[PDB]
Each structure stands twice: as C-alpha cells, then as structure tokens.
Ligand binder design. Structure first.
Ligand SMILES: N[C@@H]1CCc2nc(-c3ccccc3)ncc2C1
Lengths: 222, 220
C-alpha cells in the first residue's frame, strides 16, 4: 500500500541543492538528480554527478544547446551511449558552455535505459516516486508566482501543461489536507524551502508536473 | 551639486507595485511608471495608468508583441500618437493580449515627448533621477540571483548589458558604502523589498541598468 508520504532525502538518495546560475542547465540538473538517486540505490553511495559533463558533452547529437537548453531524456541517452558520466568533484559546474572533458577515468555512474511515464497520470507518478525513486519532470514556470514561492503548497490558477522548466520530484505528502509533490529545483538553497517547492498534487496535472515524467535505471554499473 | 540620496516615493510620485503575472509586459509597467511620476509632478494627483492599454494598442506598428515583449520608447510614442492613455481603473490589467479597447473619455494622462539617455552613463542617469523624475530602464534579469533577491545591494558577477526586462529607477543612495539604484519591478510586493531591488551603482553599468534609459515629459 503506497505510503501517505515519501521523501527520498530521508533515504539519503538526494544530493545538496545545486545552483545553475545564469546557465539554462535545469534539464542537466533534473537528469543528474534522477540518476544520483539510482546510483545510491545500486552502490549505496551518494555522489553528486557532473551536470557540467552534460552541458559540454551532450550537445548536437540529440538536440541540446548546453546553457541554452535541452531535454532530460536525451541527457539519459548520452549517458547510455557514452557508458558513463564523471563525478561533480572530478568535473565541477562552472555555469558556461565548455569543451567536452568526458572520459571514463573519473567515471562515477552509467545508465542502461530510461522510462517515460504516461501523460497527466498523477497516480502512476506517485507509484514511481514510491517504488522506483525520484522522477525527472517538466513544469510550467512562466509565472512569477513560481520563482517567488517561499513555502506552502504552490497553486497558480493560470498554470498550463505547456512545460518549460526541468526539475525533480523527490517525494509527495499533504500539508494539513493540501496534497503536494516535493520538487528539487537547481536555483540554490535560497529558492523556496532550502531549494525545494511543494507543488499542488491531485489538482488536474497542475503546471504539467505529470506531463513529461522520466526516470533512468542502472541494470549493470561496474 | 546633486543630493547623495533620492527616493521619489517620499514625494508621492510612485504608485503601488504591480504584478505582471504570466504576461511579459515589464516594458508596459516601466513606461506607465515613468509617466505616473510626470503626471503627479504636473497635476499633483497620483493615478495608476493602464499597462493593458500599451499591450493591446501599442503593437506591430511600434515593434511590440504585447505579452511577448516590447520597448518603453515606442510605448511613449503610442501615447503621443494616440494623444492619451487610460487609467488602470478604466482599463484594468488582465495579463493577456486583448484587441485595442482604448476610450478617450477615460484618458488619464498625455505625453508631449520622451528623452533617450546615453548608453552606460550612470552620472547622466543620476542627473535625470535627481532633476526630472523616475527613469524607465532595461536590466539583464536572466540570472536566478535577480528573481531570488531578498535585500541589500544586488551584485551579480555574471550580469551583462544584454537587457531583457523593463523596470523603473525611482531613486539612488548608498547602503553601508555600497552605492545603489532604487528599482521598482512589476512582480508584486513579494519580490525583493516590497517589490523593489537595490541594484549596484557606479559598478560598470551593472546588468545594463544605464544601457537604454528613457523618461517622458508632459509639457503643454
Ligand atoms: N534604441 C532602443 C531604445 C529602447 C530599448 N529597450 C530595450 C528593452 C527594454 C526593456 C526590456 C527589453 C528590452 N532594448 C533595446 C532598446 C534600444
């Protein structure tokens, strides 16, 4: 029976909140976050992975422009095709398009595949967050109410399914009746609740949270 | 000799902070803000003017795409060419592109002209804020540090002169040595210090604040 609450931070599967600065690498942070959790689940070790690696090395090949944007799914693809990604420690974030410095010497994780969840299914998404781990998602963040959020459950009447900002669902619960998704952002500790936003859940796929959900799996890392 | 500090709010020339919602109408808010001040200076009455008027009616002919962006200068142009703009009360903000609904009977201010200030001149900008009134400016606000500002003087090392966001300089001063521009934003009271951000001043045209400054006048 799915529990009332899930917080993957409690189970040591979520790294410190990152700060993307002026570089539009929200997709890179969403993807590394999801795989960070799958890494902790397989190896028992929590290691920040290199978002910089995805900005530098996951480019033209499918459809990523580094600091000018990209997709979580194609970021997973690159990790499969390269059979690796470097630790953040070995390949630190500098918030700019640099030349590829990928190689397997400071490799910290791999990826065998990734699963796209069905559009708008907030009951499926809840099952995935409970039983598989954090889930990469897009949200609609066009609304100043999003960047201004400080606490509580976020409900924006004017929100849409036309998502534009990659983030990571690390859990779910209820604040005194009001049901929510626990979302890790890449805007540093000063955004929302130490870098998290609780977003309205079971309220009509609010801001398209359940529009484009994906999670990677590590069948055999070495 | 110009004063060390200026805050146009002290002299009742600045309306409540507005909230643009999902519509990229920052330019429309910047323009009405500047004219709001000139209106109070001429008539002695503080009246919120219609940003929605500029979004609906200052469009293709003025190089403006409503909720997808525009310029304060061409917004002023439209007010001159239309020979007025409606009050916010008569023509409320709806944060979407509507068809023009301008009515001359609810006209609340006019505009005889506008002055573009020279690129990067933070000494000229200071002279205009001191002697003329609040100044419409563009800033670079692409940086999460900008949206997330809570208090103090804003300095972002990664900031550029590639401005993307219309705001209004309502004054200047220094907080404990650090010189600043007092900037009114259109993101409601919960942004920054009740809707204001103090931005680094005399620090290399920081975030292109002095890149494209303009102010309107109501002459005759
Ligand atoms: N000669 C024009 C004068 C006005 C202007 N205004 C902007 C701007 C203002 C607000 C928001 C986004 C761009 N950019 C460029 C220019 C150049």
């Amino acid at each position: 029976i799915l529990p009332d609450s899930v917080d993957w931070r409690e189970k040591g599967c979520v790294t410190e909140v990152k700060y993307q600065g002026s570089c539009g690498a929200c997709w890179a942070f969403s993807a590394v976050g999801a795989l960070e959790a799958q890494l902790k689940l397989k190896t028992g070790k929590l290691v920040s992975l290199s978002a910089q690696n995805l900005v530098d090395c996951s480019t033209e090949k499918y459809g990523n422009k580094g600091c000018n944007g990209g997709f979580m799914t194609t970021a997973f693809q690159y990790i499969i095709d390269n059979k690796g990604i470097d630790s953040d420690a070995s390949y630190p974030y500098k918030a700019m398009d640099q030349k590829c410095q990928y190689d397997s010497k400071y490799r910290a994780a791999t990826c065998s595949k990734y699963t796209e969840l069905p559009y708008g299914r907030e009951d499926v998404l809840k099952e995935a967050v409970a039983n598989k781990g954090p889930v990469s998602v897009g949200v609609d963040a066009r609304h100043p109410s999003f960047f201004l959020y400080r606490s509580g459950v976020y409900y924006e009447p004017s929100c849409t399914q036309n998502v534009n900002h990659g983030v990571l669902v690390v859990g779910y619960g209820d604040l005194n009746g009001k049901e929510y998704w626990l979302v890790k952002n890449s805007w540093g500790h000063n955004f929302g609740e130490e870098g998290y936003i609780r977003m309205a859940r079971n309220k009509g796929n609010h801001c398209g949270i359940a529009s484009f959900p994906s999670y990677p799996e590590i069948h055999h890392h070495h």
